[PDB]
Design a protein around this ligand. Structure first.
Ligand SMILES: [Mg+2]
Ligand SMILES: [Mg+2]
Ligand SMILES: [Mg+2]
Ligand SMILES: [Mg+2]
Ligand SMILES: [Mg+2]
Ligand SMILES: [Mg+2]
Ligand SMILES: [Mg+2]
Ligand SMILES: [Mg+2]
Ligand SMILES: [Mg+2]
Ligand SMILES: [Mg+2]
Lengths: 170, 293, 159, 205, 48
RNA sequence: UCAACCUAUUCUCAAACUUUAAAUGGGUAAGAAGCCCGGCUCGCUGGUGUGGAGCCGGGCGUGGAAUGCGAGUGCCUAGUGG
RNA sequence: GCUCAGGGAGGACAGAAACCUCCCGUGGAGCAGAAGGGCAAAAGCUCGCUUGAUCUUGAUUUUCAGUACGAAUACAGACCG
RNA sequence: GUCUACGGCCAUACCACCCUGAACGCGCCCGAUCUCGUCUGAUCUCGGAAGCUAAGCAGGGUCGGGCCUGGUUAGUACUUGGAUGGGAGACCGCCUGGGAAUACCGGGUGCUGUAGGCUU
């Protein structure tokens, strides 16, 4: 007997590929996660300029996108099938989100082109709950209260009872 | 560790916002640019038509600013539209137009200018502006307060605006944000705005759902079905609502009831009670320590 | 030699008070000013438009002109050996009414009402504020107990 | 090479600290200010003798360190090595200037900084020794020997406070038995009747 | 050959010989600086 | 352990730091040019013979804190500016 | 329309520092420069349209001799954004 | 008793955690054809009424932090005027009037204007 407005939902699944340079690598990484998601991603620029890494200010160095809903759940399930449903206990943020990363997108189920190549991905799952739109609506913006937030164990129990994965320690 | 950010120094140096800014409700920048009368006008009122679209009704008020507050001249809501015959759907663009019309006609009847300044009796949708006639007492001029709505094209704020304009208020406006002004060709086809005022998009979505899938139709629309609102009835129902509002615009309040005077929330605990609470907490801790030792 | 800037020396003078920064409150805008209103000046840092000068921060004058954001007021400024009745244009949020006129106004209206009445009544009631007179003669009762005796404390250095 | 202290002796100027505007100050030579068994609780040194001043003058940092060494030498000779705790309760923040003449003259005369200087009021405590209650004469003799390293008139006063605390030595024992005070090193912590009472039940736990 | 730079020593009694006298207060002071649209209306009201 | 760190404490400060914050001091007011009515005018302002301002006409002296003192105004002008 | 400095907790190569996400965050950032004031649904940052950075008579403030130039403040008459 | 819409003074209203909300509301909520806008109907805009007071919000609690207002500190510090007072000086005392602020210890924890509800 629990109140149905505290169902743990995924609010978003955000993906990025930080290629570290502009041009060909970034455009074809944009095309590969557009092949992944089905929506045209956006180009993340650089705040600073560090020549140890080889980047400049306002230079397009990454590709990111944001996925909501059934597409988010299915992309996340593909990524966890890559990650064999095994996540570490350090892969869980204190605010209740989690996230992981994969190294080649070919393991997802996306077929290959030598015109494109291989890239790795950061997946990050921003969990929520019904009611978290208070934190970013406009007209009467409030905060989210203490009982309604998501703690770390309250998120990883949800993960291992909704995906039947394991939380290996370390 | 982290350094504790919200310490005694943080709260001592912290300045609060205004109460309405903390609650989120008002924009003091726009409110100052909107309500402050010119000082050479010398206590002439400056009237506003406040539109607030809630989740279930639409508050349209007309108020001027004094020092104690905004005294509201006239008010007209959307949940009072079943007095005139709009049974449900009270938050859409068409009900925004109806409550803007009701606000305008009720204020004109309150001041004594309902015969003069009739406005658009028939609804067209195009540009209208109530230009005042000489000799007769002048047109009512007020300005439109959107509050925090992002005032883009096709907004029910501007629906209530067009309702007051067709009711007879002389509000300054442009025909850029009514539904129908397309951003590409930069013109304004008034028949599309008339369809949105008469609720033809809602009737067409009703027809579209009962052609596509009736499960989604019964989930989306249900109180329409309960109050047997059909798509062909829609435009005639809104026209009869317009005619009913323009013939009987006055509001009669509900009678004031004799109360029971029962208190629904907990009253504030007193000084004696809370000092006795901390005395009993200390005594109960000490006796639990002696019964644990 | 000092600089002759318009805002020289006004660090603490046009600053807002502690924790009363931010948005200017709106009653300050909604107050209306006739001509002949006695008006105080207090310039404010949040609105740089219409700033009154540091010579006039704290002076009181009389309105002679009202415009659509600002009032012209007639203040007495003292320069080397004379007093100029000079007029300045001040935006509305650098300004208050003075209640020094208002206490006189209520005293005039209550004097005029008690001069209107209590004149066919026959009494003659005092209308001028004589200053605080010396205390009249009065008994002081020592009800029972004796006056408590005080005598100075012996010196001990406590620090 | 330093000018005598009788030049830089009265509180003549505005206080002119080492700051963003006066930079290039040579460093103050008293840098150790507390000495002795400074790691000792309030409960094992109950006596506290203050060298109080009796003039509104300026003490040099040189004189502060000279008086520190003159007190510490006699204390480690007399009361043993770690049976005391001196602390110098003045830190020199005012810096003083030197107009060097080699010919210009008094044209543009504003000095480079020479040294640091503490400004003292009539009744402000210069030094203070915390010790046991039987080492009374030794602390009076130590402060009396350190008074000759300062100008002017200093007096010696043995206070009724419990060492380096602001609480009186007669009721300190009753308060610490009543647990309104808590020892936390060379000072003591004061506990009001104002906290959340989880702190209360933690103390009386 | 320097000399004294600025002074306000004798100035207070120099002012108070003929007195710090307040400005000439007069009934019906003028209308210069009054709002010109307001004053157009005022002088039409006086015209008619 | 020893450091940084963190949390409650503690000693000493500031012309170009400050939550507080004096004394002395600086404006304004202490009425006839003031109040209170009646009515006209306006191209300004205007839901509103609304708002504001200007004009007329009438009525009201206990001269509206103390003290003291006849005031206001215009020419011409020397010397001075270590 | 959005919130800035900093910090915390996470994420393939990635680290002390590239990018993504949550949370705290009264200004500890930014506003060309010197400092002082001022500023958070803004005066900051990002976008859309732009030329009131235009034509013109008076009044005023500031230094002041109660003169100039400079800079600025309310108005007013168009022509505009 | 209380809520919404617009507010005034802007912490006695803020902040952290816990408890309780009947009715109307306010919300969360369900969708994206149309209006609109985004990488993403998350936000904004648009059409609704299956569910829930879980959150916001409201009322209350905390020997709570803060804030407000009092006592103490203290007639202390400082100070107007005065002396052919003291002191080698620094500085201090007195006559004449004014008179602060920490630490420490109490009390309070939004009032309120206009319009419209609920308590059939
Ligand atoms: Mg706005
Ligand atoms: Mg000097
Ligand atoms: Mg000479
Ligand atoms: Mg000369
Ligand atoms: Mg803006
Ligand atoms: Mg700018
Ligand atoms: Mg949605
Ligand atoms: Mg709730
Ligand atoms: Mg609840
Ligand atoms: Mg408290």
């Amino acid at each position: 007997k629990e109140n149905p407005m505290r169902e743990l939902r995924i609010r978003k699944l955000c993906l990025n590929i930080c290629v570290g340079e502009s041009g060909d690598r970034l455009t074809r990484a944009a095309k590969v996660l557009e092949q992944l998601t089905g929506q045209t991603p956006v180009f993340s620029k650089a705040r600073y300029t560090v020549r140890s890494f080889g980047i400049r200010r306002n230079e397009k160095i990454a590709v990111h996108c944001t996925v909501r809903g059934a597409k988010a759940e299915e992309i996340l399930e593909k990524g966890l099938k890559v990650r064999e449903y095994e996540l570490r206990k350090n892969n869980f943020s204190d605010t209740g989100n989690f996230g992981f990363g994969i190294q080649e997108h070919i393991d997802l189920g996306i077929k290959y082109d030598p015109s494109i190549g291989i890239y790795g991905l950061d997946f990050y799952v921003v969990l929520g709950r019904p009611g978290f739109s208070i934190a970013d609506k406009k007209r009467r913006t409030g905060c989210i209260g203490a009982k309604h937030r998501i703690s770390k164990e309250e998120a990883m129990r949800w993960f291992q009872q909704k995906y039947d994965g394991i939380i290996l320690p370390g | 560790f982290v350094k504790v950010v919200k310490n005694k120094a943080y709260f001592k140096r912290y300045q609060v916002k205004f109460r309405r800014r903390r609650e989120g409700k008002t924009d003091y920048y726009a409110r100052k640019r909107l309500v402050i009368q010119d000082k050479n006008k010398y206590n002439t009122p400056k009237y506003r038509m406040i539109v607030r679209v809630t989740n279930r009704d639409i508050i349209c008020q007309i108020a001027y600013a004094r020092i104690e507050g905004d005294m509201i001249v006239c008010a007209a809501y959307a949940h009072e539209l079943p007095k005139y015959g709009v049974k449900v759907g009270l938050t859409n663009y068409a009900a925004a137009y109806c409550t803007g019309l009701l606000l305008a006609r009720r204020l004109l009847n309150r001041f004594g200018m309902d015969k003069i300044y009739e406005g658009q009796v028939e609804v067209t949708g195009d540009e209208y502006n109530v230009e005042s006639i000489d000799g007769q007492p002048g047109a009512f001029t007020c300005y439109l307060d959107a509050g925090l709505a992002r005032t883009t094209t096709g907004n029910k704020v501007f629906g209530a605006l067009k309702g007051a304009v067709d009711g007879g208020l002389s509000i300054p406006h442009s025909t850029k944000r009514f539904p129908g002004y397309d951003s590409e060709s930069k013109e304004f086809n008034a028949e599309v705005h008339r369809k949105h005022i008469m609720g033809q998009n809602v009737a067409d979505y009703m027809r579209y759902l009962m052609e596509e899938d009736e499960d989604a139709y019964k989930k989306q629309f249900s109180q329409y079905i309960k109050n047997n609102v059909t798509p062909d009835m829609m435009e005639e129902m809104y026209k009869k609502a317009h005619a009913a509002i323009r013939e009987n615009p006055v509001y009669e309040k509900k009678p004031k009831r004799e109360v029971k005077k029962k208190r629904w929330n907990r009253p504030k605990m007193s000084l004696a009670q809370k000092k006795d609470r901390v005395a009993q907490k200390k005594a109960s801790f000490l006796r639990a320590q002696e019964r644990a030792a | 030699t000092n600089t002759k800037g318009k805002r020289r020396g006004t660090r603490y003078m046009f600053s807002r008070p502690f924790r009363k920064h931010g948005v200017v409150p709106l009653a300050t805008y909604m107050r209306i000013y006739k001509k002949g209103d006695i008006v105080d000046i207090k310039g404010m840092g949040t609105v740089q438009k219409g700033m009154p000068h540091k010579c006039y921060h704290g002076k009181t004058g009389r309105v002679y002109n009202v415009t659509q954001h600002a009032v012209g007021i007639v203040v007495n400024k003292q320069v080397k050996g004379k007093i100029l009745a000079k007029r300045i244009n001040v935006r509305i949020e650098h300004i208050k009414h003075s209640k020094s006129r208002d206490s006189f106004l209520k005293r005039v209206k209550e004097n005029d009402q008690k001069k209107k009445e209590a004149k066919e009544k026959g009494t003659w009631v005092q209308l001028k504020r004589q200053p605080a007179p010396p205390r009249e003669a009065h008994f002081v009762r020592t009800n029972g107990k004796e006056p408590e005796l005080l005598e100075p404390i012996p010196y001990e250095f406590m620090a | 090479g330093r000018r005598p202290a009788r030049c830089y002796r009265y509180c003549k100027n505005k206080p002119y600290p080492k700051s963003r505007f006066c930079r290039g100050v040579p460093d103050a030579k008293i840098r150790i200010f507390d000495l002795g068994r400074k790691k000792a609780k309030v409960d094992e040194f109950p006596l506290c003798g203050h060298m109080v001043s009796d003039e509104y003058e300026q003490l040099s940092s040189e004189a502060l360190e000279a008086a520190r060494i003159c007190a510490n030498k006699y204390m480690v000779k007399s009361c043993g090595k770690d049976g005391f705790h001196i602390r110098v309760r003045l830190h020199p923040f005012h810096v003083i200037r030197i107009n060097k003449m080699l010919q210009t003259g008094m044209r543009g005369a504003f000095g480079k900084p020479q040294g640091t200087v503490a400004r003292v009021h009539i009744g402000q405590v210069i030094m203070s020794i915390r010790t046991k209650l039987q080492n009374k004469e030794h602390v009076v003799e130590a402060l009396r020997r350190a008074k000759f390293k300062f100008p002017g008139r200093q007096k010696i006063h043995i206070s009724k406070k419990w060492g380096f605390t602001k609480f009186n030595a007669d009721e300190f024992e009753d308060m610490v038995a009543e647990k309104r005070l808590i020892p936390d090193g060379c000072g003591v912590k004061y506990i009001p009747n104002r906290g959340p009472l989880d702190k209360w039940r933690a103390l009386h736990s | 050959a320097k000399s004294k730079n600025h002074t306000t020593h004798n100035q207070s009694r120099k002012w108070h010989r003929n007195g710090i006298k307040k400005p000439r207060s007069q009934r019906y002071e003028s209308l210069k600086g009054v709002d010109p649209k307001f004053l157009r209306n005022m002088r039409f009201a006086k015209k008619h």
